Amino acid sequence: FRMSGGDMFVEYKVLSRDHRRSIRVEDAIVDPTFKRTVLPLGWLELLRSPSLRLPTGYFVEETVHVSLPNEANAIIAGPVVLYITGQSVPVVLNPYFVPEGTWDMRTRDGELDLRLGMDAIEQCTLFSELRPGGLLYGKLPENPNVRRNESLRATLGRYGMKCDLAESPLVPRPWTRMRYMFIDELQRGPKLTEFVGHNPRNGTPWRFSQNTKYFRIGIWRDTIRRNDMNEGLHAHSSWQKSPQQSVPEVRFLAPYP
Amino acid sequence: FRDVEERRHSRDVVNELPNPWYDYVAHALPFPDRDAGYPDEYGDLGQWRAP
Amino acid sequence: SRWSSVWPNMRYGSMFLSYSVGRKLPMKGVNWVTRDSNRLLNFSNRYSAVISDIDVKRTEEELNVALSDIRWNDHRRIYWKCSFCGSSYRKNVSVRTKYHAGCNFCKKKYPSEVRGEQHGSPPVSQAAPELTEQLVDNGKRDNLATLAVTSKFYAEWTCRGCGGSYRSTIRSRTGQVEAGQCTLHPDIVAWSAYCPSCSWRPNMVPIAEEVSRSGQFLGLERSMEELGPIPRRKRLAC
Amino acid sequence: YRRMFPEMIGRTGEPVQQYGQMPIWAGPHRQHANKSEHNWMFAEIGVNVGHEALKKLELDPTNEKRRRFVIRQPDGTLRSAKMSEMRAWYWKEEWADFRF
Amino acid sequence: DEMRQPYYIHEKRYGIFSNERNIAKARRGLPFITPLYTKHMNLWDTDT
Amino acid sequence: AKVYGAVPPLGAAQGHRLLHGKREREGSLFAVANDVKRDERLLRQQLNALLEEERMPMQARL
Amino acid sequence: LYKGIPRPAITNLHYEPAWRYTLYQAGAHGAQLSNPRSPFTAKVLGDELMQVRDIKSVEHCKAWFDRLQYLINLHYEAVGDIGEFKSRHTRHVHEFF
Ligand SMILES: [Zn+2]
Numbered sequence: 140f141r142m143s144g145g146d147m148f149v150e151y152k153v154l155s156r157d158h159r160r161s162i163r164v165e166d167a168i169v170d171p172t173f174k175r176t177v178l179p180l181g182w183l184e185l186l187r188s189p190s191l192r193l194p195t196g197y198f199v200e201e202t203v204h205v206s207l208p209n210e211a212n213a214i215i216a217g218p219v220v221l222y223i224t225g226q227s228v229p230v231v232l233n234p235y236f237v238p239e240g241t242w243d244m245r246t247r248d249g250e251l252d253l254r255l256g257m258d259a260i261e262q263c264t265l266f267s268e269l270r271p272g273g274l275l276y277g278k279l280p281e282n283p284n285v286r287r288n289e290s291l292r293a294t295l296g297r298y299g300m301k302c303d304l305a306e307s308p309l310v311p312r313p314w315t316r317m318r319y320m321f322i323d324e325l326q327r328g329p330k331l332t333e334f335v336g337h338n339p340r341n342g343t344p345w346r347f348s349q350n351t352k353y354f355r356i357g358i359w360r361d362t363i364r365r366n367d368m369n370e371g372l373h374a375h376s377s378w379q380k381s382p383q384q385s386v387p388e389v390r391f392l393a394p395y396p
Numbered sequence: 397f398r399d400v401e402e403r404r405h406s407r408d409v410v411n412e413l414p415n416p417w418y419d420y421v422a423h424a425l426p427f428p429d430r431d432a433g434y435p436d437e438y439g440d441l442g443q444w445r446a447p
Numbered sequence: 448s449r450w451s452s453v454w455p456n457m458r459y460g461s462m463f464l465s466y467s468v469g470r471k472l473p474m475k476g477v478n479w480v481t482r483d484s485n486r487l488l489n490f491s492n493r494y495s496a497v498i499s500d501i502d503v504k505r506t507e508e509e510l511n512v513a514l515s516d517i518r519w520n521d522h523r524r525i526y527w528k529c530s531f532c533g534s535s536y537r538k539n540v541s542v543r544t545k546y547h548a549g550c551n552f553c554k555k556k557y558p559s560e561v562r563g564e565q566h567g568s569p570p571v572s573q574a575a576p577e578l579t580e581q582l583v584d585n586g587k588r589d590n591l592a593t594l595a596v597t598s599k600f601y602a603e604w605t606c607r608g609c610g611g612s613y614r615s616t617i618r619s620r621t622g623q624v625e626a627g628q629c630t631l632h633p634d635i636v637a638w639s640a641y642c643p644s645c646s647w648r649p650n651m652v653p654i655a656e657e658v659s660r661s662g663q664f665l666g667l668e669r670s671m672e673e674l675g676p677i678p679r680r681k682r683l684a685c
Numbered sequence: 686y687r688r689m690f691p692e693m694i695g696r697t698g699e700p701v702q703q704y705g706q707m708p709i710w711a712g713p714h715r716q717h718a719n720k721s722e723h724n725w726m727f728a729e730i731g732v733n734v735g736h737e738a739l740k741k742l743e744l745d746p747t748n749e750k751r752r753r754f755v756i757r758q759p760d761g762t763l764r765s766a767k768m769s770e771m772r773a774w775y776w777k778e779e780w781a782d783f784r785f
Numbered sequence: 786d787e788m789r790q791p792y793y794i795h796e797k798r799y800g801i802f803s804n805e806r807n808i809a810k811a812r813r814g815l816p817f818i819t820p821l822y823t824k825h826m827n828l829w830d831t832d833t
Numbered sequence: 834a835k836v837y838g839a840v841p842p843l844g845a846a847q848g849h850r851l852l853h854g855k856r857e858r859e860g861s862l863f864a865v866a867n868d869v870k871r872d873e874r875l876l877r878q879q880l881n882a883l884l885e886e887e888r889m890p891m892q893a894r895l
Numbered sequence: 896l897y898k899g900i901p902r903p904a905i906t907n908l909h910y911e912p913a914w915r916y917t918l919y920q921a922g923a924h925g926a927q928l929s930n931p932r933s934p935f936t937a938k939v940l941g942d943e944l945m946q947v948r949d950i951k952s953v954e955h956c957k958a959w960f961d962r963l964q965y966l967i968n969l970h971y972e973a974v975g976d977i978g979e980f981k982s983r984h985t986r987h988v989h990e991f992f
């Protein structure tokens with residue numbers, strides 16, 4: 140992703156579905172006047188890797204008129220993965236494969252004049268470049284919905300933007316949205332994880348409270364003679380003698396207590 | 397009877413359509429074409445082994 | 448005897464049987480009273496039709512059950528007289544309210560059970576108005592004329608020949624069936640014209656005719672005159 | 686996932702097709718017969734068929750030894766089995782994948 | 786049928802359709818029938 | 834628009850079967866049948882090859 | 896080694912591919928049309944016979960859709976009263992779908 144002459148140039152990597160075969164493209168125009176991205180027909184055989192899931196290289200192989208770039212003058216081939224340099228997410232095209240006669244982009248020496256259409260812009264961070272204020276906004280095809288020459292704050296002003304970000308005291312400032320961040324290892328330690336049920340995943344973390352039938356006699360004996368040790372199932376309760384009760388997310392490796 | 401029937405049979409278009417049951421015998425041999433899930437030399441079940 | 452112990456057949460329509468001591472006992476412990484909240488007659492804002500379908504004479508006779516004693520959900524099986532087709536049956540109110548259950552004849556009222564109103568077929572009053580007079584007269588003949596001409600409704604008709612009453616199907620009488628359903632017998636129209644007892648004689652006329660002409664009868668005749676560009680496959684005979 | 690693995694949602698199936706009927710020489714006299722109340726399913730069995738181990742090979746439309754089914758509709762016609770009906774004739778299979 | 790050596794083995798040893806002969810025999814199944822040899826073919830004492 | 838790994842640009846004079854689309858030869862049922870069977874088992878053979886490369890032990894690969 | 900019996904000639908069949916035959920085709924046995932969607936069958940039956948063949952599946956599907964738009968047009972406004980004690984339920988359409 141870089142700028143020149145008013146438009147974007149992006150490096151990308153075309154790939155078969157199994158990522159067996161690959162082609163780098165250095166400077167490609169990002170042009171949102173193409174409904175679908177166009178490649179030279181010759182690559183169709185270069186990118187075809189016949190795996191197990193796709194016995195023939197591609198899932199979709201057909202013929203389309205494809206007169207948009209310049210009666211079946213081209214071929215729709217899918218799905219070919221595409222990795223653009225900026226983005227973390229692969230974008231999956233079903234591109235137009237065009238022969239020399241239909242359209243020939245040899246345009247300058249060694250230069251193949253490839254470009255990226257809205258096929259691939261819809262799937263990237265590049266899409267946010269398509270909204271008002273972005274760098275592709277100038278190149279959108281003319282609409283009732285898209286005003287060409289308006290200043291940004293004019294446009295957003297019509298959509299209801301009034302002041303700058305969090306400028307009025309009534310709206311909380313963005314960075315107090317997250318104040319504390321919880322990381323067990325850095326503070327207070329891990330939780331004490333118990334279960335009542337079949338597994339850790341099938342049961343509740345909770346023990347049963349003091350009000351249980353079987354716990355009442357025990358808890359009684361435990362309140363009256365506090366110092367001697369007492370038999371019972373009243374041990375399994377959430378309530379007990381010690382100041383530290385058993386309830387979920389006790390931090391037991393914490394220094395205090 | 398045979399003749400009238402052949403006539404009105406050949407006249408209808410829903411015929412001239414292959415009938416898997418009427419037309420052939422899939423397999424004439426008493427043993428199967430490939431091994432399906434029968435106990436092994438060790439006595440282990442079909443589910444316990446891959447051929 | 449022995450065979451008395453056998454459980455009856457329970458076809459697909461019918462739910463739980465309650466034929467065993469285990470199946471009877473827990474419901475035996477339910478005792479209903481009719482309060483103001485349970486009484487059918489209070490609820491006529493909704494269930495008015497259900498109220499006008501009850502046999503008020505017969506239920507109090509046979510069952511000793513008053514009409515003011517009948518709950519909207521009542522489990523007891525009481526007698527009904529259908530206000531559409533006019534046939535009598537015995538069911539519980541609970542089953543007519545919880546889902547719609549009612550006279551068994553009006554189940555087949557529409558031309559197909561699977562799709563209730565999906566018919567595009569005209570009523571009987573239109574397609575074959577000459578049928579409406581052959582219906583045995585219970586006074587409901589204006590409701591029965593309203594049905595689809597394709598309807599599978601089982602209706603009773605007074606036979607032309609002997610003036611007695613038999614029971615056949617509306618669509619069997621007209622002969623017309625809806626696209627995608629099963630074809631009836633090609634002759635069904637001529638054959639249901641009369642009683643099952645009166646039908647033989649008239650339909651044996653054309654056969655005697657055809658053995659009078661050629662001195663020989665084969666059922667083939669119709670198909671033959673059906674005979675007096677069909678795409679066909681390539682064959683492997685060669 | 687949907688863009689990258691299009692073939693994981695099946696969009697294709699073996700079409701339900703009507704079989705040609707065998708000629709009845711007895712003519713109209715018997716024509717009533719095969720036309721009846723119900724549907725009649727017939728699944729084949731034998732030494733080469735009905736084995737769960739081989740199931741997909743047996744439902745595979747490419748295989749010519751493929752297990753044969755047929756259905757008589759109440760109007761008397763015959764058609765091939767819908768895929769559900771085909772699968773009814775194997776011991777019930779449980780598919781659950783816990784991975785996502 | 787999943788726990789049992791299949792039937793066809795007895796054909797593979799004695800020839801195909803060999804038992805149809807045996808089934809028409811005078812004294813059959815009281816108690817005894819012409820012995821039916823089914824043993825997994827990798828265990829055959831004869832060949833292996 | 835510089836391209837790496839793509840060898841001479843625009844390949845060399847190769848049209849797809851469907852696009853070029855020479856008039857379909859009418860084979861007798863013989864020709865067609867045989868085409869179907871040989872290319873069916875051609876695909877079968879390929880599937881085999883791939884499965885064998887998938888299942889190859891590491892020592893074999895080294 | 897060479898004691899005990901001569902080497903069976905059929906052994907040759909391993910080393911020489913010339914001798915691997917199949918006298919017949921796959922379906923020459925009379926099953927050729929098994930695969931409904933094979934090119935061979937499209938060539939044998941021709942297209943209009945294939946139309947005739949799949950008409951039943953076409954009308955299956957049309958039946959599903961027809962039911963669906965009947966239910967939609969019936970229950971579209973969700974609340975009304977369409978019958979004696981019965982009233983519109985969107986839930987009907989939902990579950991059919
Ligand atoms: Zn009724």
Ligand SMILES: [Zn+2]
Nearest residue numbers: 606609642645
């Ligand atoms: Zn009569």
